[PDB]
Design a protein around this ligand. Sequence first.
Ligand SMILES: CC(C)(COP(=O)(O)OP(=O)(O)OC[C@H]1O[C@@H](n2cnc3c(N)ncnc32)[C@H](O)[C@@H]1OP(=O)(O)O)[C@@H](O)C(=O)NCCC(=O)NCCS
Ligand SMILES: CC(C)(COP(=O)(O)OP(=O)(O)OC[C@H]1O[C@@H](n2cnc3c(N)ncnc32)[C@H](O)[C@@H]1OP(=O)(O)O)[C@@H](O)C(=O)NCCC(=O)NCCS
Ligand SMILES: CC(C)(COP(=O)(O)OP(=O)(O)OC[C@H]1O[C@@H](n2cnc3c(N)ncnc32)[C@H](O)[C@@H]1OP(=O)(O)O)[C@@H](O)C(=O)NCCC(=O)NCCS
Ligand SMILES: CC(C)(COP(=O)(O)OP(=O)(O)OC[C@H]1O[C@@H](n2cnc3c(N)ncnc32)[C@H](O)[C@@H]1OP(=O)(O)O)[C@@H](O)C(=O)NCCC(=O)NCCS
Ligand SMILES: [Cl-]
Ligand SMILES: [Cl-]
Ligand SMILES: [Cl-]
Ligand SMILES: [Cl-]
Lengths: 391, 391, 393, 393
Amino acid sequence: PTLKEVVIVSATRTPIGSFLGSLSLLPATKLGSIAIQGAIEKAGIPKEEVKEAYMGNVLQGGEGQAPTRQAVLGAGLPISTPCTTINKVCASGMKAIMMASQSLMCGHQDVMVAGGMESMSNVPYVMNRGSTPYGGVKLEDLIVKDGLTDVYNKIHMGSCAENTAKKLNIARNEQDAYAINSYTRSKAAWEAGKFGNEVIPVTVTVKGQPDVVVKEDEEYKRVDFSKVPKLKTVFQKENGTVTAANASTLNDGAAALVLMTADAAKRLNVTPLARIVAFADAAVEPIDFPIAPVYAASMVLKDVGLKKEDIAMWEVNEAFSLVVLANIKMLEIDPQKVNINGGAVSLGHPIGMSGARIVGHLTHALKQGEYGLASICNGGGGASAMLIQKL
Amino acid sequence: PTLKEVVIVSATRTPIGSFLGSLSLLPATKLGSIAIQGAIEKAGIPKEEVKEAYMGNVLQGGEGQAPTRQAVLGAGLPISTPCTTINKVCASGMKAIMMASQSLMCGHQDVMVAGGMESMSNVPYVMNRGSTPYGGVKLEDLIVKDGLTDVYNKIHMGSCAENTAKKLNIARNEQDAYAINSYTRSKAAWEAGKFGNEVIPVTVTVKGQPDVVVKEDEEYKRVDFSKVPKLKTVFQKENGTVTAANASTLNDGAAALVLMTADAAKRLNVTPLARIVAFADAAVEPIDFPIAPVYAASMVLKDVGLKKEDIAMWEVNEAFSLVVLANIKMLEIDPQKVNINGGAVSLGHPIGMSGARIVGHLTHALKQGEYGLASICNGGGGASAMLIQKL
Amino acid sequence: SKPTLKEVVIVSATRTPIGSFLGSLSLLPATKLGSIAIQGAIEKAGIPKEEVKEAYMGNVLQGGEGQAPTRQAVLGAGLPISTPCTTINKVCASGMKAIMMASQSLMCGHQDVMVAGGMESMSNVPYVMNRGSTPYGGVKLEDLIVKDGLTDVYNKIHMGSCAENTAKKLNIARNEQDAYAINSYTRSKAAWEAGKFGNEVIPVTVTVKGQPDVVVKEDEEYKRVDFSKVPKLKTVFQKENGTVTAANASTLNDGAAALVLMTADAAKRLNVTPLARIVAFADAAVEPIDFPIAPVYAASMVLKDVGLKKEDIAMWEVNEAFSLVVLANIKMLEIDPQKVNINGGAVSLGHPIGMSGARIVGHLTHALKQGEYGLASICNGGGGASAMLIQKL
Amino acid sequence: SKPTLKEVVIVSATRTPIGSFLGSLSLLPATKLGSIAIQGAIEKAGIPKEEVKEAYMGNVLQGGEGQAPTRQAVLGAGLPISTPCTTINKVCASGMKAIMMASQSLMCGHQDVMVAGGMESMSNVPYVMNRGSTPYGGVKLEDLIVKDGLTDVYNKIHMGSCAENTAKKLNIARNEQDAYAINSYTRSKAAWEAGKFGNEVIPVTVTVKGQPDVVVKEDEEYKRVDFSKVPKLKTVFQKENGTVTAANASTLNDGAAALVLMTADAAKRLNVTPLARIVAFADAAVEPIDFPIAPVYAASMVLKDVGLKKEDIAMWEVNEAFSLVVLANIKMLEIDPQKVNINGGAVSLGHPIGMSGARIVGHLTHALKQGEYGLASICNGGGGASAMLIQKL
Ligand SMILES: CC(C)(COP(=O)(O)OP(=O)(O)OC[C@H]1O[C@@H](n2cnc3c(N)ncnc32)[C@H](O)[C@@H]1OP(=O)(O)O)[C@@H](O)C(=O)NCCC(=O)NCCS
Ligand SMILES: CC(C)(COP(=O)(O)OP(=O)(O)OC[C@H]1O[C@@H](n2cnc3c(N)ncnc32)[C@H](O)[C@@H]1OP(=O)(O)O)[C@@H](O)C(=O)NCCC(=O)NCCS
Ligand SMILES: CC(C)(COP(=O)(O)OP(=O)(O)OC[C@H]1O[C@@H](n2cnc3c(N)ncnc32)[C@H](O)[C@@H]1OP(=O)(O)O)[C@@H](O)C(=O)NCCC(=O)NCCS
Ligand SMILES: CC(C)(COP(=O)(O)OP(=O)(O)OC[C@H]1O[C@@H](n2cnc3c(N)ncnc32)[C@H](O)[C@@H]1OP(=O)(O)O)[C@@H](O)C(=O)NCCC(=O)NCCS
Ligand SMILES: [Cl-]
Ligand SMILES: [Cl-]
Ligand SMILES: [Cl-]
Ligand SMILES: [Cl-]
């Protein structure tokens, strides 16, 4: 058998909610159902055509058994649909798409859904199993413990960012300017209707309360440019660079893509949005995760013999402003082509979801024939990257 | 390009420890490192040849960031090794091998490690984020909440098994007979030294106490045949059949396989143990998970054009004695060919690990040219199955 | 022969306003409310703080309050380090039992001046997790209010459910209970608006850095009512044939009360006008479920002991743990309803459990006319009650 | 002139053995240990259970014990539902303060027979979590033993660190404290071997499903020693210039003690022969940090009150909160160490904080010879102490 070509038929997401904000009442798996149902609807195919599903989801504790299965059944897909939940930290939503693509390439399935979901609002605290130690019991926060602490260095993701800021000489003022730019671009894009095809509204229903329709990303409005340069450097008190404003935030949301072989898209007579050209993972020293996307991006370009100049649009996940700046600095690419409609610093970062979102955004924003490259760093020193071409 | 042939070059595991037992001090990721390091040593390849790693792991809460990365780096593999943690509940360890095989088939990597890990002893309790409700709250046990409760029926896996016992008329006595058979087979296999190429010992070190060397599975010695018929049916008060003895137990362990392309095995002067022929996933109603493996196995057989008679040995994961008996009954297979050297009822069931263990067991136990078929059910109504041939 | 005892007088009785649960005083620990009340009482008494020899404070839910709650309250009020302190727990009777035991010390001539009262911050009562191995399947975090405060150990049911048992026994219906409750709110509002707590309650300023000061000057709970809703409310303690509701039961609350007690001799020596004389007191206990009726027996013992008749009592303070309790007491004692809980009680003012026994004795002190007798009684979990007779001077 | 009071006698004094932390008695709630000691005390008294009119029990760490701990102990001992109950908290002094307050009631003639004592199950003391919203990043649930039991509120340090302060000021060195500690362990063992607790201690049977009964018939702690290791230990509360260690400090423990108290008249009515007469008692307080020396002033008060001299005391029980405390007391009082804590104490027998004050009065009761005076004293957190003088009959 020859490898099959893979196309993205649809890409849909919920709005991104703020921590304890507009979507905080909905579990991750419910956000997942919403996104999955929307993508199938946008693709114009029966739910029965979806053969298997992979969802990224980093913080699975307390979500109940088989989170992806919950999302899938919750969207009314057939009970025959096998489901797998994927965890590559912040790269989860992209790696799900990559692994689904590999299955399709093998001819093992012909139509799949892949994406990611996270409700950081509902991530619980943990108490260890065993005897309570004299003097007190520690209740750890899984966001911090599983989500945001580097295992090897025993520091926050934001302190690894500081490390890169030192080595690459990326200053506080530069990171602030980038963050302000992200907020600016996100607002402009929302005001321009650039997410009309990508985002689907979520209705939040509470007994005895009026329904609340969440139609846009929450985070980008949560900013005061005037305070930005005055904020404390929260990950490094002295001579720091990373702040609450220039870092990504904690958030809730889900994204899903319908993926198909070229043959399935033709059989079903759907109009594919983009072809998946290539993808790769790179890994580096854990503290150096901010630069991992540079190597992953380089890998994909080399794989298919393209040069950085051939890329119309770059999505370099805004884990921190520092990360994007480091990537631009090492790749020497045009900043006007990078995160053009905002990103995680201003839209928020539901960690298992963001890698899917940025691929979906390229699928909508690229013009016919253009190449888009999405890359995303992950805790532990990894990154994933994907190259797509708009059809 | 055409699909690459995938071979298993090594397959190694820790002993399985009892709940709060001999390996209970080790995190799942450390057990993972031990299995991964052992599999690479047995493979006889430079560790730098391992390109990427997938590990199954169902209960990831509190294990820290990127469990697979922790296992991999802990095994001394290069920081350049991308890592992804896989959750298909009890199928995780098998699904990891399947997904890694797809990557290899695509030519995306030529050498990978795939397996599973679980430390049920160290799975924590959770408290919801937010304000404490007047009157108190029970902190949920993640083994129960995420591992063992069916979301849709709101009952234990054990109670779902009861549903199948009723439907297929598989009585308490038959289940008990199967369980005794498993314990008997496990002891006989351990006494015959059948795991000398499969299991590697674990030394547990405690400061101020002597070393403990764990060299065999702990669970299978925890049995009393005279008591088996006397136990209460713990999942169902009236007309129950499932008991603590005839159900799998809660356990700790890890397993890892080194997978390669046939070309990479050739390049590296490696003599592989087995060829991965085909694999599949099936899903049915959540409550009917015990029968999913029947459909998954039939899928693989039909794909390859083998008849059930062509299979030399079957590994049908012993989630409950009930599960294996439903499979034997529906497939109409020789029970002397099924779980020949024991299984999860008596060896234990570290849920993320077992799917990998049973494939690794086939790789060692099959004779040259023989086909082995492994299948494993999973919460949510799923199963994975895989066919291999011994080389 | 009977002992010859010193005469005991109340020289001052002061309290904080009562705050609602998680309400206006919720940021202040019980011990801090204690300090405010104690300082208040001493200032009112017009004596040096150093004259106070010893202190007893009722306090039912002491968990997480820190070491020696009463000592904290006392040292926090600027009393000398030489002041011995004891924290008293007779559940809801704690505030009165503290005064009783202080009276006994005075009677014996073991001290000549004491502070006694009660304090409670139900807002700050914590949750608990057991010491030991975490059980498979879950770990309960228990609410100490429910576990230690409100659950009868023996019947394994809420105080409110025990109350239902007495409603049943004595045919006290929902409507009567509701009428009593409305009556309580009515009296509270009237008294508050008439200025009747002018010398009883002292204001509290709550300071939050960055926020405007809040001055709490009156009881919070009595404004929290809607008469129209009262009859509609669900019966929260019993699904079938219930009578007790959130409106006709006492609420959870924060507050402290403190009395300066001295021997007749010390009041003379210190040249202070005693407010009232403490005549007698008693404790009574019955079947745990039957606590609503324990104050009946306690009041009876007190009257029998002193040789007075129920008719001789000018003013009754029967703690409004539930409207039911007051009604049960009125029924069994056959007393003039118009003489009971004249200026409201716990149903409308709130029930910081360790404080209430002290507050009601303090109220009689202020409300009685010269020469009048007041009888205060209060039930407590476990099936007990305390009662106290005083006479205005 | 001076009040004429009822004579108070101790008719019995009984206790459970003291269990170690998480040890032999760890499965029993404090209230159950209370029931056992109370039942034993009434049996040893040879009186009807119905004769006990009221009950006071010391109990420092009441969190999670359920409603009204003393009521649970009393009703759990099979005493009448008519028995009023109050739970007393003066930290480590609780057990003694209970006896004192009961004595005061008896003196006033308000009751004629009472049980008074103390109980603590440190093994079963829970952790707490604040009411409200868990902060981002997690929280440490506090250990109530540490938070309510052992931390000085004002200095924000452990009792052990407060002890270091006194060691400094009075030049009480490590070696002296260690010598005292060994002496306590020696005396405890000698007394147990000599059968010195025959009438004082009652055995408890611990019953668990599936396992065989365990009969606990002696104090667990005094065996948990290694004399050779003692001077090798590091100083747990103060690393630089410390003196107090795990060995020479009291331990965490489970236990209950109960005494039958009655008026001299009641004893005659009931035809029981009393063990001792309760002569006088007092409370003293000093700076919170200085609690180790509070018992000196409390003891002096009692002697001055009755007009006796230190030399008139045949036996001293000075609670061994720390070896430091006893030495501080011996030094300031200038008394004969051979008459102090003669049959061991809290450093070796353990310190269930709410019971010890009652245990040490009970021990005096049994060990004194006819006519001899015994003085018991006990420090408490916050800077307090209680002391009691008894005379053997
Ligand atoms: C950075 C982080 C710790 C936020 O910390 P925080 O201090 O609790 O953030 P806050 O929202 O309380 O903001 C603190 C201050 O910054 C201000 N602020 C936050 N965002 C702002 C913005 N966009 N513009 C201006 N001001 C802002 C707030 O108003 C606040 O001001 P104040 O203290 O005077 O009230 C948290 O969002 C985080 O961990 N982010 C990283 C997520 C991550 O690491 N993801 C994975 C990537 S590898
Ligand atoms: C079944 C389960 C709840 C354990 O129940 P449990 O009652 O706490 O188990 P216990 O260890 O207390 O055993 C109970 C009794 O069975 C006995 N017993 C257990 N296994 C036995 C065996 N193999 N032979 C003989 N007796 C046995 C014990 O001796 C005990 O007897 P006792 O009451 O006289 O002491 C737990 O192991 C479980 O949930 N297993 C299923 C795991 C699962 O669902 N995995 C996923 C697959 S879908
Ligand atoms: C009764 C108790 C359980 C509170 O129950 P609750 O149902 O959570 O009380 P809530 O505040 O939520 O009130 C429930 C309803 O009653 C209404 N309500 C309460 N008090 C009211 C009043 N005074 N007037 C009018 N309506 C009132 C509320 O508006 C609410 O209405 P809703 O259901 O439409 O929202 C609690 O206060 C309690 O335990 N009280 C007894 C304390 C005690 O036992 N003390 C010791 C004595 S022995
Ligand atoms: C001191 C205290 C914290 C225990 O400390 P700890 O370090 O956990 O005590 P441990 O049981 O772990 O013993 C510590 C060491 O001392 C040793 N030790 C303890 N008691 C000993 C004894 N009687 N003889 C010899 N060695 C002893 C132990 O063997 C241990 O040695 P290791 O570190 O080599 O293993 C605790 O008992 C305490 O707080 N006591 C004071 C109680 C109190 O303040 N009560 C109120 C009075 S005001
Ligand atoms: Cl990685
Ligand atoms: Cl599935
Ligand atoms: Cl004190
Ligand atoms: Cl009582």
